Amino acid sequence: MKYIQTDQILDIPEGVTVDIKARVVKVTGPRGELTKDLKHIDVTFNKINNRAIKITVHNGDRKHVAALRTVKSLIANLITGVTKGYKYKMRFVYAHFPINVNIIKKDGQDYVEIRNFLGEKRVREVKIHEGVTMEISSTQKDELIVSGNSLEAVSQNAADIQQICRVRNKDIRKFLDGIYVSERGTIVE
RNA sequence: CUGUCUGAUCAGGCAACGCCGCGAAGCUACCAUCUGCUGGAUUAUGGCUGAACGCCUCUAAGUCAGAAUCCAUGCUAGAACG
């Protein structure tokens, strides 16, 4: 129906800065720096003050307006990742065969290696994304910790681990073995 | 090797390739031997982040993986007016 104007407000905490220029957002905080390209969306920005930013869609239909809260959430995730960080936790689940998980460095590249999944001789290796750190928890058995500044990279890389451990040609209601995300949260709670 | 002809011998001719054994060379047989490559993008499907719709959601923007598929790599020809 082409709403004349829709607005959202970005809250930027006391220790972050947000530089925006030609739909390229650069978010600096105590934990580092994150940048996101928004050239695929028609939006405009205004600086209310040092603690707030207005995001506006002029004369937008239903779908274009739907793409405004999405932008706000993506940039807010940039802020909360450069302040608090992002931590996902994965539990190793199996009935009989334990799942052997190791962080290796083949060719200077960190890889997650999964061995003995359902007794298979095949070895599964999942690349570790840049800016993401994996770690075997030393306080909970059979648990992998995925941490970083970028929620997108952290969650996608945890998903890559989860997807690589799919059971085939068996009743997956009975054969529940896998590596599953058990906790999504921040590094600095 | 047979029949016949050159008188015999030797050496030969003919039998509308006379017949039999072997037979190189050449050709040839899953009847013999050798050889048949590796990158990218996808479909179905499963996902991530994420609004619409204060929740939710793989989908709307964006995005990951993924088939004997597709485009290449490689192989054959080389436009007889490139």
- Tracing tokens 């648990």 back to the chain, one arrives at A143
CA A48 → CA A45, A51, A123, distances in Å? Answer: 9, 8, 53
**Token couple for A142:** 């059979």
Closest CA to A10 of A51, A58, A70: A51
Burial of A134: CB neighbours in 10 Å, binned 0-12, 13-18, 19+: buried
CA of A34 to C1' of B67 (A): 37
**How many CB atoms are located within 10 Å of the residue A86 CB?**
24
Closest CA to A83 of A30, A132, A33, A131: A30
Strand partners, A182: none
**Token couple for A143:** 């648990």
Checking each nucleotide's C1' against the CA of A156, the nearest proves to be B48
3-state secondary structure of A170: coil
The reply to whether A125 has its C-beta less than 7 Å from any atom of strand B is no
Closest CA to A178 of A119, A117, A124, A125: A117
Checking each nucleotide's C1' against the CA of A63, the nearest proves to be B60
The reply to whether A67 has its C-beta less than 7 Å from any atom of strand B is yes
| Helix residue spans in chain A (DSSP H) | 62-83, 151-163
CA of A53 to C1' of B9 (A): 133
CA A61 → CA A43, A57, A172, distances in Å? Answer: 13, 9, 43
Strand partners, A109: A106
Q: How far apart are CA A167 and CA A178, in angstroms?
A: 8
Q: Are the CB atoms for A37 and A23 separated by under 8 Å?
A: yes
- Within 7 Å of a protein beta carbon, the nucleotides of strand B are 46-52, 60-65
Deposited resolution, Å: 2.2
Q: Which of residues 141-180 of A touch strand B (CB under 7 A)?
A: 151-152, 155-156, 159-160, 162-163, 166
3-state secondary structure of A65: helix
The reply to whether A73 has its C-beta less than 7 Å from any atom of strand B is yes
Strands, E, within chain A: which ranges?
3-11, 17-20, 24-29, 32-37, 44-49, 52-60, 86-93, 100-106, 109-115, 124-127, 132-136, 143-148, 178-185
Q: What are the backbone angles phi and psi of residue A156, rounded to the nearest 5°?
A: -65, -35
Q: How far apart are CA A54 and CA A48, in angstroms?
A: 6
CA of A87 to C1' of B25 (A): 82
Own/partner contacts of A66-73, CB < 8 Å, gap of 24 or more, are A67/A41, A67/A43, A68/A6, A68/A8, A68/A43, A69/A8, A71/A8, A71/A38, A71/A41, A71/A43, A72/A8, A72/A9, A72/A10
Q: How far apart are CA A160 and CA A9, in angstroms?
A: 33
Q: How far apart are CA A20 and CA A28, in angstroms?
A: 11
Q: How far apart are CA A169 and CA A96, in angstroms?
A: 17
The identity of residue A114, as a single letter, is I
Q: How was this model experimentally determined?
A: cryo-EM
Checking each nucleotide's C1' against the CA of A70, the nearest proves to be B51
